[PDB]
Amino acid sequence: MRGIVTIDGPSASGKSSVARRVAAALGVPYLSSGLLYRAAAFLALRAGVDPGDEEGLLALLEGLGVRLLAQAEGNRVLADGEDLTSFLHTPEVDRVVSAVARLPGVRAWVNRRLKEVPPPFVAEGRDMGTAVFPEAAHKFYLTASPEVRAWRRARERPQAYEEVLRDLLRRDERDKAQSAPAPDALVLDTGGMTLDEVVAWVLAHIRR
Ligand SMILES: Nc1ncnc2c1ncn2[C@@H]1O[C@H](COP(=O)(O)OP(=O)(O)O)[C@@H](O)[C@H]1O
Ligand SMILES: Nc1ccn([C@@H]2O[C@H](COP(=O)(O)OP(=O)(O)O)[C@@H](O)[C@H]2O)c(=O)n1
Ligand SMILES: [Gd]
Numbered sequence: 001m002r003g004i005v006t007i008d009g010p011s012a013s014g015k016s017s018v019a020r021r022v023a024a025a026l027g028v029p030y031l032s033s034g035l036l037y038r039a040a041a042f043l044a045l046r047a048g049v050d051p052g053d054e055e056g057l058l059a060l061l062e063g064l065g066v067r068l069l070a071q072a073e074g075n076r077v078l079a080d081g082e083d084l085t086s087f088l089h090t091p092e093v094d095r096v097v098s099a100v101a102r103l104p105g106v107r108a109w110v111n112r113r114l115k116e117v118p119p120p121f122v123a124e125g126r127d128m129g130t131a132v133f134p135e136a137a138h139k140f141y142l143t144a145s146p147e148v149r150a151w152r153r154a155r156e157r158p159q160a161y162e163e164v165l166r167d168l169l170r171r172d173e174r175d176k177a178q179s180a181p182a183p184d185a186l187v188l189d190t191g192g193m194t195l196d197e198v199v200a201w202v203l204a205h206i207r208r
Contacts, residue, residue, distance in 0.1 A: 001026045001028065001120055001137075001138070001206055002119065003119055003120055003136065003137040004119050004120060004122070004133045004136040004137060005019075005121075005122035005123070005136065005138040005139075005140070005202075005206060006123050006124070006125075006129035006132075006133050006136045006140065006182070007122060007123070007124040007128070007140045007141075007142060008124065008125055008127065008128050008129055008140070008141050008142070008181065008182070008185065009126075009141055009142035009143055010143060010168075010175070010179065011149055011153065011168050011171055012144070012148075012149035012150070012152045012168065013142035013144050013149060013190055014142050014144070014152075014190045014195065015032075015124040015125070015142055016032055016034075016074075016124060018124075018142065018199055018202060019031075019032070019122045019123075019124040020072070020074060021199040022199055022206070023072070023122045024072055025203055026120070026122070026203075026206070028120045028122065029072075029121045030075070030121060030122045030123070030124065031068060031070055031075065031114055031117060031123040031124070032068070033110060033114055033124065033126075033132070034097075034124070034126075035068060035076075035085070035088060036068055036077060036109075036113055036114075037097055037100065037101045037106070037110060038077075038089070038093050038097055039077040039079065039084060039088060040057065040061060040066075040097075040100050040101075040109070040110070041093055041096050041097040041100040041101075042084060042087055042088055042093055043057075043060055043061065043066070044057050044060070044100060045092070045093075045096065047060055051096065051099050054104075055105075057103070057105075057106065058105050058106070058109060061106075061109055064079045064080050065080060065081075066079045066113075067113070068113055068114075070117070070121070089156070089157075090157075091157055091158070091159050091167065094157075094167060095167060095171075097171075098171055098174035098175055101175070102174075102177070107178070111131070111132050114128075114132055114133075123136075126175055126178045127178045127179070129141070129182035129184075130180060130181075130182045131178065134182065138205070138206050139182045139184055139185040139186065140185055140186050140188060140202055140205070141181035141185040141186070142188055142190050142198070143188070143189055143190070144191035145191050146168060146169055146172075147165065148191040148192075150162075150164045150168050153168060186205055188201065
């Protein structure tokens with residue numbers, strides 16, 4: 001696989017886990033676009049920047065030199081060379097990230113970072129196969145029921161299922177504009193499947 005594989009989908013549909021495993025099986029990096037959006041949100045919070053102040057936020061992001069590090073075991077985001085990854089997957093970041101991700105300048109900043117990577121790679125996000133890498137040779141859209149996505153996510157947050165579900169429903173709703181599947185994406189419902197099964201299906205499709 002020498003081109004680009006995109007994997008898009010709503011929260012907890014399985015994108016990061018599948019992209020990591022598929023990329024490792026193909027011998028290429030994977031790029032988690034949401035990690036950059038999460039970093040943008042985390043930095044704005046930490047800096048006391050008003051979430052509607054695009055200019056100030058962009059001044060900060062470019063000013064700090066924020067970078068995505070694609071490592072096989074998982075992506076990392078650095079700001080001024082320092083690893084912020086451990087702070088990006090909190091309920092707090094989950095709850096405010098959509099508001100920051102809606103800013104045109106932030107999306108343009110994230111996409112510039114993604115476009116700096118030479119192919120091949122597998123990229124996961126909301127609009128990888130539509131807005132960012134529409135030329136991708138292999139596109140996938142993962143989806144599952146809100147209940148199972150909330151069930152999966154609750155295992156990864158200091159929150160119970162019902163709150164996780166409420167939060168997930170809201171976030172996916174707030175992400176609607178950037179979340180439609182590419183028309184040529186293979187849509188897979190991952191509910192009821194193991195990570196291994198989804199990876200196997202995706203690789204089989206890629207290797208058709
Ligand atoms: N069939 C599956 N496919 C992918 N991930 C799964 C699956 N079943 C359970 N998981 C768990 O659900 C979580 C999904 O997280 P993640 O890979 O980040 O998905 P997403 O990027 O869509 O939020 C992981 O904890 C993963 O281990
Ligand atoms: N390409 C994408 C990727 C992420 N995002 C935003 O970034 C936030 C986090 O993405 P994420 O993929 O890390 O979230 P999860 O699906 O991993 O739970 C999201 O809710 C989206 O608002 C986005 O607008 N567009
Ligand atoms: Gd993820």
